[PDB]
């Protein structure tokens, strides 16, 4: 048979993952990754080989597969909180920050020519955003300041600082820049501050250190060649390589997955054939 019609194929498809509820096989539901530049399946394998000791040199008597480790790599261009939480071995948390007025804080060590983030606490460890009002007072750094009640001008040894030539404020970011040549804040100075925090909805990804299991699936829409879909009933997802935040290319996360047997009845991978 000379003329045989080959299935020459150019790969294109949508990749989905469903995180299991931690400590279980219970599916949360298939999140689409967005655009994946690559999706590759790999298989390292090791074999136990037996050689005859009764005849010849290195005549193989037997061999068996010890394991083939099915698994793979994929990248995605789509940067969002779900993909980032999956890459950072962690969790998306959505919150509204507490609207608070006359929130007060102290910066006991200060160097000028530096940035300070307002409202860094266990509730918001990346700090406040959206400040409506701000004021600050300087003091000598050896003074043991505390600010339990009243405005910051009430505290012992303190003096009001005007902004011009002493500080700049990014009200949206919640950030103070102490000016690098500032006259009022040279020497052994400390600061106390006071601000008003707006109510706003905000998303964090928290990079904890948890092994993320789930089921992986690629559905293919190949522009040439017959299409076929891939399902991995359990995988463990992990970050692969490194994630470049600056460069002339598009940002990509890279993921690696190891395929696993969900239970003793299921295969590690199923390929579904359209025709």
Automatic annotation (TrEMBL):
Family of the protein in this entry: Belongs to the intimin/invasin family.
Protein name as annotated: Major tail protein
